[PDB]
């Protein structure tokens, strides 16, 4: 089997992407944030505290003839950005782009943090990291991809995120028309439960490529590119007027600037992030100070190849017995 679903930016900045997901019988379609940095499929629901729902579409398990409470199971997750959610668990039929999994754990939110409530466009998350990170207790549950893997034509999914445009998540096949050149594959460590890999270096604009190992994670659920302070300083030094602002929370630059590109290495291959992808616009409405899309990871503990980086590539998440990542230009 295979599946193919379009993923759409939630706003004009590409802050996140939503993909329609069919849950239950008859189908209830929710728009989920596919997140290769986490491993829970959780949804706003009829169980979510009413004051914490503000425009989201909810899953109502009592209206699904295939929903079954997973007795005793609870979940609770906290994300790198400080947001969180928690609740109980059903199993139900879940379909993405024509690919159906029966008995998928659907984690129903009883509580969500304010950042989720305030974002009416995201109805939940669909985690695509390794199932070892799933938070369901006392019996950890499998991700949608893990459940689908054996049925797929090939045990892979691909992320093709658009710049200010829709893109595609495919399951079970590699669309050879969706990228240019070849796909360069690189080794993955699953020791932390992430799609963790080592970039071979970087360049700023037309500058020389610096060969240096940068360990990080491929994370579709993170907006920006978070890299070591040395690398980030070298990037922003090429933008006149750029400065790290403790009060704003990162690097900011004059909105009148033209940003240089940023290249990262994948083995001997190179992925070029155009400068425009690094512009996240005014820090507040009407400001001439703009927020940068490359930021320091120094306070995170891990480097994160988020959407800024991934949207410049066609990315293969190869879930074979020994997983690997692939990157192609597009
Ligand atoms: O604040 C300043 O010093 C000038 C305007 C800028 N905004 C962002 C970076 S420089």
């Amino acid at each position: 089997s295979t599946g193919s679903a379009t993923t759409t930016p939630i706003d004009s900045l590409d802050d996140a992407y939503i993909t329609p997901v069919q849950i239950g019988t008859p189908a209830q379609t929710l728009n989920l944030d596919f997140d290769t940095g986490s491993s829970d499929l959780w949804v706003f629901s009829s169980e979510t505290t009413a004051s914490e729902v503000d425009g989201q579409t909810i899953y109502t398990p009592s209206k699904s003839t295939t929903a079954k409470l997973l007795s005793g199971a609870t979940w609770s997750i906290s994300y790198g950005d400080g947001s969180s959610s928690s609740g109980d668990v059903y199993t139900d039929t879940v379909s993405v782009g024509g690919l159906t999994v029966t008995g998928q754990a659907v984690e129903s939110a009883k509580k969500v943090s304010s950042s989720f409530t305030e974002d009416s466009t995201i109805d939940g998350l669909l985690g695509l990291a390794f199932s070892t990170l799933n938070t369901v207790s006392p019996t950890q549950q499998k991700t949608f991809f893990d459940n689908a893997k054996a049925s797929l034509d090939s045990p892979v999914f691909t992320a093709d995120l658009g710049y200010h445009a829709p893109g595609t998540y495919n399951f079970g096949f590699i669309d050879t028309t969706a990228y240019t050149g070849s796909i360069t594959y690189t080794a993955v460590s699953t020791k932390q439960g992430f799609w963790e890999w080592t970039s071979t270096g970087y360049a700023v604009g037309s500058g020389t490529f610096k060969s240096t190992s940068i360990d990080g994670i491929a994370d579709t659920g993170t907006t920006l590119l978070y890299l070591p302070a040395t690398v980030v300083s070298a990037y922003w030094a090429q933008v006149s007027g750029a400065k790290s602002s403790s009060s704003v929370g990162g690097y900011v630059f004059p909105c009148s600037a033209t940003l240089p590109s940023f290249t990262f290495g994948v083995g001997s291959a190179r992925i070029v992030i155009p400068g425009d992808y690094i512009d996240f616009g005014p820090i507040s409405t009407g400001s001439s100070s703009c927020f940068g899309g490359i930021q320091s990871s120094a306070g995170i503990g891990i480097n994160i190849f988020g959407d800024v980086a991934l949207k410049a590539a066609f990315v293969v998440f190869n879930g074979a017995t020994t997983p690997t990542l692939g990157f192609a230009s597009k």
Side-chain angles (χ1 to χ4, degrees), residues 1-62 64-67 69-109 112-141 143-148 150-190 192-242 244-330:
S1 61
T2 64
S4 181
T6 297
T7 193
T8 300
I10 64 165
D11 63 23
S12 65
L13 296 179
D14 297 346
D15 282 317
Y17 298 78
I18 50 172
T19 307
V21 176
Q22 282 71 49
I23 309 176
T25 310
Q28 303 178 37
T29 299
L30 276 64
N31 296 328
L32 306 188
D33 184 350
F34 282 23
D35 180 12
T36 62
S38 68
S39 306
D40 288 48
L41 193 175
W42 73 260
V43 295
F44 278 78
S45 76
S46 59
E47 298 179 334
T48 309
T49 299
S51 64
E52 296 178 352
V53 184
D54 186 7
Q56 295 81 11
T57 295
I58 64 169
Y59 169 59
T60 302
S62 66
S64 176
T65 60
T66 43
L69 179 73
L70 186 60
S71 183
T74 61
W75 62 280
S76 180
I77 191 161
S78 299
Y79 295 101
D81 63 357
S83 66
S84 62
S85 52
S86 63
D88 55 17
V89 187
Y90 294 82
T91 57
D92 210 341
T93 301
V94 172
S95 300
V96 176
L99 170 65
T100 300
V101 166
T102 58
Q104 173 64 44
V106 176
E107 300 173 34
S108 164
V112 304
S113 64
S114 59
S115 64
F116 289 114
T117 300
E118 292 161 6
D119 183 2
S120 68
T121 72
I122 292 176
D123 303 323
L125 267 63
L126 188 148
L128 292 168
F130 293 87
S131 292
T132 52
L133 295 180
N134 176 265
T135 77
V136 176
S137 182
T139 306
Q140 190 169 65
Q141 300 296 304
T143 68
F144 175 82
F145 177 56
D146 247 350
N147 281 324
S151 305
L152 295 176
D153 292 356
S154 180
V156 305
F157 69 90
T158 65
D160 180 8
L161 301 179
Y163 169 63
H164 293 172
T168 304
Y169 281 103
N170 291 328
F171 293 83
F173 71 106
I174 290 163
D175 180 357
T176 62
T177 73
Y179 57 87
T180 63
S182 54
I183 304 175
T184 296
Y185 290 86
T186 197
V188 164
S189 173
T190 64
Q192 296 193 84
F194 300 121
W195 292 92
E196 187 171 1
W197 65 291
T198 302
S199 173
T200 49
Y202 69 98
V204 177
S206 58
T208 61
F209 186 85
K210 176 73 168 179
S211 291
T212 185
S213 294
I214 302 169
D215 179 292
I217 65 168
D219 184 1
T220 58
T222 290
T223 312
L224 305 185
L225 174 54
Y226 294 90
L227 292 173
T230 49
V231 176
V232 175
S233 183
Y235 178 80
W236 290 108
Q238 298 305 311
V239 179
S240 276
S244 184
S245 166
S246 56
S247 59
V248 173
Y251 281 88
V252 286
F253 66 91
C255 294
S256 60
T258 302
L259 296 180
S261 64
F262 183 85
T263 300
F264 63 95
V266 181
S268 54
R270 307 289 179 252
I271 299 293
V272 179
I273 304 171
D276 288 356
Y277 290 26
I278 300 161
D279 187 346
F280 279 74
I283 61 173
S284 294
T285 300
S287 180
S288 72
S289 299
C290 275
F291 197 69
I294 296 175
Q295 299 291 346
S296 177
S297 64
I300 296 175
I302 197 157
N303 300 305
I304 306 172
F305 293 87
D307 297 335
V308 164
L310 303 181
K311 75 178 69 177
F314 178 88
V315 187
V316 180
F317 296 78
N318 169 29
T321 302
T322 298
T324 66
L325 282 166
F327 292 81
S329 295
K330 66 188 182 188

Coordinates of all heavy atoms in Angstrom, one line a residue, residues 184-186 197-200 209 265-270:
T184 N 20.8 11.8 -1.6 CA 22.0 11.3 -0.9 C 21.5 10.9 0.5 O 20.8 11.6 1.2 CB 23.0 12.4 -0.7 OG1 23.5 12.8 -2.0 CG2 24.1 12.0 0.2
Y185 N 21.8 9.6 0.8 CA 21.4 9.0 2.1 C 22.5 9.1 3.1 O 23.7 9.1 2.7 CB 21.0 7.5 1.9 CG 19.7 7.4 1.1 CD1 19.6 7.4 -0.3 CD2 18.5 7.3 1.8 CE1 18.4 7.3 -0.9 CE2 17.3 7.2 1.2 CZ 17.2 7.2 -0.2 OH 16.0 7.0 -0.8
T186 N 22.1 9.2 4.3 CA 23.1 9.4 5.4 C 22.6 8.6 6.6 O 21.4 8.4 6.8 CB 23.2 10.9 5.7 OG1 24.4 11.2 6.5 CG2 22.0 11.5 6.4
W197 N 21.0 12.7 12.7 CA 22.0 12.5 11.7 C 23.1 13.5 11.8 O 23.0 14.3 12.7 CB 21.3 12.5 10.3 CG 20.7 13.9 10.0 CD1 19.7 14.5 10.6 CD2 21.3 14.8 9.0 NE1 19.5 15.8 10.0 CE2 20.5 16.0 9.1 CE3 22.3 14.8 8.1 CZ2 20.7 17.1 8.2 CZ3 22.5 15.9 7.3 CH2 21.7 17.0 7.4
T198 N 24.1 13.4 11.0 CA 25.2 14.3 11.1 C 25.5 15.0 9.8 O 25.9 14.3 8.8 CB 26.5 13.5 11.6 OG1 26.3 12.9 12.8 CG2 27.7 14.5 11.7
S199 N 25.2 16.3 9.7 CA 25.6 17.1 8.6 C 27.1 17.2 8.5 O 27.8 17.2 9.5 CB 24.9 18.4 8.7 OG 25.3 19.3 7.7
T200 N 27.6 17.3 7.3 CA 29.0 17.4 7.0 C 29.5 18.8 7.0 O 30.8 19.0 6.8 CB 29.3 16.7 5.7 OG1 28.4 17.1 4.7 CG2 29.2 15.2 5.8
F209 N 32.8 26.4 1.8 CA 32.1 25.4 2.6 C 33.1 25.0 3.7 O 34.2 24.7 3.5 CB 31.8 24.2 1.7 CG 31.0 23.1 2.5 CD1 29.6 23.2 2.5 CD2 31.7 22.1 3.1 CE1 28.9 22.2 3.2 CE2 30.9 21.1 3.7 CZ 29.6 21.2 3.8
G265 N 25.6 20.5 4.5 CA 26.1 19.3 3.8 C 25.4 18.0 4.2 O 25.0 17.8 5.4
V266 N 25.1 17.2 3.2 CA 24.6 15.8 3.5 C 25.6 14.9 2.7 O 25.6 14.9 1.5 CB 23.2 15.7 2.9 CG1 22.7 14.3 3.2 CG2 22.3 16.7 3.5
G267 N 26.5 14.3 3.5 CA 27.6 13.6 2.9 C 28.3 14.6 2.0 O 28.6 15.7 2.4
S268 N 28.6 14.1 0.7 CA 29.3 15.0 -0.2 C 28.3 15.9 -0.9 O 28.8 16.8 -1.7 CB 30.1 14.2 -1.2 OG 29.2 13.2 -1.8
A269 N 27.0 15.8 -0.7 CA 26.0 16.6 -1.3 C 25.8 17.9 -0.5 O 26.2 18.0 0.6 CB 24.7 15.9 -1.5
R270 N 25.1 18.9 -1.1 CA 24.8 20.2 -0.6 C 23.4 20.5 -0.8 O 22.9 20.4 -1.9 CB 25.7 21.2 -1.2 CG 27.2 20.9 -1.2 CD 27.8 20.9 0.2 NE 29.2 20.6 0.2 CZ 29.7 19.5 0.8 NH1 28.9 18.5 1.3 NH2 31.0 19.3 0.8

